[PDB]
Design a protein around this ligand. Structure first.
Ligand SMILES: Nc1ncnc2c1ncn2[C@@H]1O[C@H](COP(=O)(O)OP(=O)(O)O)[C@@H](O)[C@H]1O
Ligand SMILES: [Mg+2]
Length: 449
């Protein structure tokens, strides 16, 4: 539209030559309201120029520039951030209301003798004049004044506003502008994060600036021609609960570069000291994150084909994202193609997918039901007293895992819905997400009056 002045929200190290290195606070000259994930910018601070990630800047002198404004973040995700144990009382953020378009919301962390650590949500009424107010008896001209005022007096709020909600730098959309197929010499593998059946995983760095996860397929796993073909679709899948596909190295051995999840896989995270303190409310919430990512996959008319706790990756504040979606199809192994052998996840595979190769989003729904048993058992293998060989015949005859101990029979009933024989009667991920987000009377409710 018209080159305007922007401000940097976070630091960013120049990963390439064409991008722009800038620190939080730098005034940037960018073409206003220009579509894309990478915008051309001119730094009025350093006089340097280059492309910048569009989610690292906001118009100067706008609410988006304020560090306590989190934009279109959900009530459920705001609570995740605010309920962090290291946040003091009065840790807050401002966001948009999900139940009242045009209104804002002040989310604040608080402590109570009944609930303990909880978040209070206060709706902010914006006026035609531009003024904001939480209660009728105290009003302000700007959202900034409101924050300043309640940072000195609770005056009705559960607690004075103390700290702004901590946040980690968001992901850029792609490693760089036009960056997709990269050379192997651009990746530097630093730490082996783990090992799979068809290759290894690595913590590395691209251009020695940005930390990424590098998956290395052993030769013969999949043809580069078909991997690149499918990778043009996986690069389109962008959602907060999907691990982002960054780049690829075409020449075998194929390397897959993805966003790095520091807490490891959900399965391992459910075991050991990490999973000791997890309680059902957190497991249900983690299920809702997974269902949200799969609901996006469901909207894009895509199929995961290998949904299981081992392919869910954990981050800070118990963030969970779906990983390794769409790779299972490209496996060239004759035994995995015919879903046989000790390397096929038969215990997460719907019977019609294992018997007739009918992989659909509904067979992922089946997999989700299995995944829920891993969550409510903290990593226990499905069908524990059964070997792969015998699972498919038992579920084909109608056997279903019973309600695990420490699993509410209401969630096992959800599991059995996912385990219906008829795929088209299995529920959607839109349903599962809403069900699991509202499991504890948690359906968008109760802004404090
Ligand atoms: N994007 C990632 N970020 C951080 N760690 C990862 C990532 N992807 C995989 N890992 C780690 O590497 C290991 C191997 O992953 P993978 O080869 O997909 O094994 P599988 O899918 O069979 O569990 C996992 O246990 C996980 O902890
Ligand atoms: Mg995997």
């Amino acid at each position: 539209r018209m080159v305007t002045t922007f401000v940097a929200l976070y630091d960013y190290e120049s990963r390439t030559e064409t991008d722009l290195s800038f620190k939080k606070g730098e005034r940037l000259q960018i073409v206003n309201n220009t579509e894309g994930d990478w915008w051309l910018a001119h730094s009025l601070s350093t006089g340097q120029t280059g492309y910048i990630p569009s989610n690292y800047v906001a118009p100067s002198d706008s609410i988006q520039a304020e560090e306590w404004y989190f934009g279109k973040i959900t009530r459920r995700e705001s609570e995740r951030l605010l309920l962090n144990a290291e946040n003091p009382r009065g840790t807050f953020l401002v966001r948009e209301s999900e139940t009242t378009k045009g209104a804002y919301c002040l989310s604040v962390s608080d402590f109570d003798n009944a609930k303990g650590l909880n978040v209070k949500h206060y709706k902010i009424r914006k006026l035609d004049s531009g003024g904001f107010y939480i209660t009728s008896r105290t009003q302000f001209n700007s959202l900034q004044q409101l924050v300043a005022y309640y940072s000195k007096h609770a005056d009705g709020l559960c607690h004075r506003l103390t700290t702004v909600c901590p946040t980690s730098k968001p992901q850029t959309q792609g490693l760089a502008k036009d960056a997709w197929e990269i050379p192997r010499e651009s990746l530097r593998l630093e730490v082996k994060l783990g090992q799979g059946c068809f290759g290894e995983v690595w913590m590395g760095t691209w251009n020695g600036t940005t930390r990424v996860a590098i998956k290395t397929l052993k030769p013969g796993t999949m043809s580069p021609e078909a991997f690149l073909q499918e990778a043009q679709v996986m690069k389109k899948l962008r959602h907060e609960k999907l691990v982002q596909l960054y780049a690829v190295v075409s020449e075998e051995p194929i390397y897959i570069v993805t966003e790095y999840m520091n807490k490891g896989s959900l399965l391992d995270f459910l075991k050991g000291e990490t999973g000791k303190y997890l309680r059902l409310p957190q497991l249900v919430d983690m299920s809702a994150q997974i269902a949200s990512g799969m609901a996006y996959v469901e909207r894009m008319n895509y199929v995961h084909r290998d949904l299981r706790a081992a392919n869910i990756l954990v981050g800070e504040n118990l963030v969970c994202k779906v990983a390794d979606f769409g790779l299972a199809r490209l496996i060239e192994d004759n035994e995995y193609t015919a879903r046989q052998g000790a390397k096929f996840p038969i215990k997460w595979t719907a019977p019609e997918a294992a018997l007739y190769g009918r992989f659909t989003i509904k067979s992922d729904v089946w997999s989700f039901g299995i995944l829920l048993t891993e969550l409510t058992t903290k990593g226990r293998v499905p069908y524990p007293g059964m070997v792969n060989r015998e699972v498919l015949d038992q579920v084909e005859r109608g056997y279903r895992m019973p309600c695990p101990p420490e699993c509410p029979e209401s969630l096992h009933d959800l599991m059995c819905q996912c385990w219906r024989k008829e795929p088209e009667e299995r529920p959607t991920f839109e349903y599962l997400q809403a069900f699991l987000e509202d499991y504890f009377t948690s359906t968008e409710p109760q802004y404090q009056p």
